[PDB]
Design a protein around this ligand. Structure first.
Ligand SMILES: [Ca+2]
Ligand SMILES: [Ca+2]
Ligand SMILES: [Ca+2]
Length: 317
């Protein structure tokens, strides 16, 4: 497995974990380390059960307690992390259509780097929490080419088999090339292949594209380096068939800079820690000659750092 999360061989009982978290909230302040020690080491089912039990036993919402009890980047990380991945994606996707917070890239990212069922599960969480559809928010909030691409992206329920059709791949490779060549970046056919074909079939298409034209599709999506739509296309491509190169680069820009973009760092670590963060981290090393964990040591502080690290696979020390 490519997951970075570590879970004890022996998991304590749900009431053991629940009373320990209770204790962590007692007094003026909180024992962040104890929180990190528990939540940072439970899978989604475990966390779900913990939340369900915490509510039944103590009569309060754990996430409400976590919110009141903490602050800033550490609070955002913990809450984001604590959620079920479907709830987490719903929340993130929701933020990405609103005013202060809004992000095309994030919507693209959720749509393209999730499996079909993970995306569906997000959409169901989205219904439960927000009493609307992700599609209707996305459709309401985006315009132009962004609208044209993102509405089908977040709407997809892709076929997930490994079957590839090579004739089709070859045909659709030239279609893509023809349309891109004529600057018709948002043509039905471009949108269609990226939003509807399986990830295996798109990969095959881009392979034929390269064989046939001698460079990969992103090289031809650079005519205007300023253009935000091209950047979204190039990102869509990467997310669909090279997700770990996408995420490496998100981390790289978040960290290798005079800041940290803590939002991007938090999003990547908390959404991928249960999926493929190990693979992203290897890609980070390859591409930056520093381990990810070390790069985060380096750019982050305190409990934020400490959880980032724990989520990124750090044991003990
Ligand atoms: Ca307290
Ligand atoms: Ca930095
Ligand atoms: Ca540090």
């Amino acid at each position: 497995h490519h997951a970075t999360l570590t879970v004890p061989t022996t998991v304590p009982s749900v009431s053991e974990d629940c009373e320990q978290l209770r204790k962590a909230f007692s007094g003026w302040g909180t024992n962040e380390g104890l929180i990190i020690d528990i939540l940072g080491h439970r899978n989604a089912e475990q966390r779900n059960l913990i939340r369900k039990t915490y509510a039944e036993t103590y009569g309060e919402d754990l996430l409400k307690a976590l919110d009141k009890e903490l602050s800033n980047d550490f609070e955002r990380l913990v809450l984001l992390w604590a959620l079920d991945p479907a709830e987490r994606d719903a929340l993130l996707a929701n933020e990405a259509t609103k005013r202060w917070t809004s992000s095309n890239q994030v919507l693209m990212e959720i749509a393209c780097t999730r499996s079909a069922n993970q995306l569906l599960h997000a959409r169901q969480a989205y219904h439960a929490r927000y009493k609307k559809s992700l599609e209707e928010d996305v459709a309401h909030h985006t315009t132009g080419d962004f609208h044209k691409l993102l509405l089908p992206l977040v709407s997809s329920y892709r076929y997930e088999g490994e079957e590839v059709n090579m004739t089709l791949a070859k045909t659709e490779a030239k279609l893509l090339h023809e349309k891109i060549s004529n600057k018709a970046y948002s043509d039905d056919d471009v949108i269609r292949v990226l939003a509807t074909r399986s990830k295996a079939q798109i990969n095959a298409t881009l392979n034929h594209y390269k064989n046939e034209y001698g460079n990969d599709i992103n090289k031809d999506l650079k005519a205007d380096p300023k253009d935000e739509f091209l950047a979204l296309l190039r990102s869509t491509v990467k997310c669909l068939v090279y997700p770990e190169k996408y995420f490496e680069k998100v981390l790289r820009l978040a960290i290798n800079r005079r800041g940290t973009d803590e939002g991007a760092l938090t999003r990547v670590v908390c959404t991928r820690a249960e999926v493929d963060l190990k693979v992203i981290a290897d890609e980070y090393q390859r591409r930056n000659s520093v381990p990810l964990t070390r790069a985060i040591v380096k750019d982050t502080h305190g409990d934020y750092e400490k959880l980032l690290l724990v989520l990124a696979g750090h044991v003990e020390n």
